[PDB]
Design an enzyme around this catalytic site. Structure first.
Site, PDB file in Angstrom:
ATOM      1  N   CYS A 167       0.420  49.960  61.507  1.00 51.09           N
ATOM      2  CA  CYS A 167       0.607  50.960  62.642  1.00 51.09           C
ATOM      3  C   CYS A 167       1.881  50.974  63.329  1.00 51.09           C
ATOM      4  O   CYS A 167       2.559  50.152  63.409  1.00 51.09           O
ATOM      5  CB  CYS A 167      -0.474  50.583  63.698  1.00 51.09           C
ATOM      6  N   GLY A 168       2.317  52.367  63.509  1.00 47.85           N
ATOM      7  CA  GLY A 168       3.464  52.722  64.418  1.00 47.85           C
ATOM      8  C   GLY A 168       3.824  52.231  65.711  1.00 47.85           C
ATOM      9  O   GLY A 168       4.506  51.378  66.013  1.00 47.85           O
ATOM     10  N   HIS A 169       2.656  52.966  66.462  1.00 49.08           N
ATOM     11  CA  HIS A 169       2.616  52.617  67.742  1.00 49.08           C
ATOM     12  C   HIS A 169       2.934  50.979  68.085  1.00 49.08           C
ATOM     13  O   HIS A 169       3.423  50.502  69.314  1.00 49.08           O
ATOM     14  CB  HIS A 169       1.191  53.004  68.408  1.00 49.08           C
ATOM     15  N   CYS A 170       2.735  50.153  67.172  1.00 44.74           N
ATOM     16  CA  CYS A 170       2.995  48.759  67.395  1.00 44.74           C
ATOM     17  C   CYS A 170       4.358  48.279  66.931  1.00 44.74           C
ATOM     18  O   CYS A 170       5.002  47.719  67.537  1.00 44.74           O
ATOM     19  CB  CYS A 170       1.718  48.003  66.357  1.00 44.74           C
TER      20      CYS A 170
END
Length: 133
Positions: free
Chosen positions: A37-40
């Protein structure tokens, strides 16, 4: 824990998580992230730094850790972690809270402080206590 290039991010499992938090009378900031996951990925560093800025400001009282919802099911299910990143706070004695807001050490830390005072005593001389009782 402390190794390679990384802040003060502590890795906890679905078993030790309870032996580290519940086994401690200190605030443990559990953050669930996903390796896909990017947001992470953008928070990865934000959390690392915050941990230090929080541990130094809380004198260790408020610690910050990270967990992989991909490997941790016991906990993820306990509260239900499906939307990462997922920051959750736990305070020995009272029910845990759900952190929802800025995902930058700047904010993450700001909060940790709001609690530090709650548990940890403020900057002002004060008796320790006769055998903690």
């Amino acid at each position: 824990g402390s190794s390679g290039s990384s802040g003060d991010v502590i890795e906890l499992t679905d078993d030790s998580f309870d032996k580290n938090v519940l086994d401690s009378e200190d605030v443990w900031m559990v953050e669930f992230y996903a390796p896909w996951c990017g947001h992470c990925k953008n928070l990865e560093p934000e959390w690392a730094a915050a941990a230090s800025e929080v541990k130094e400001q809380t004198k260790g009282k408020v610690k910050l850790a990270a967990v992989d919802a991909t490997v941790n099911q016991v906990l993820a299910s306990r509260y239900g972690i499906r939307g990462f990143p997922t920051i959750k706070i736990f305070q020995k004695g009272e029910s845990p809270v759900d952190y929802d807001g800025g995902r930058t050490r700047s904010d993450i830390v700001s909060r940790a402080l709001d609690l530090f005072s709650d548990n940890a005593p403020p900057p002002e001389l004060l008796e320790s206590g006769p055998s903690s009782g």
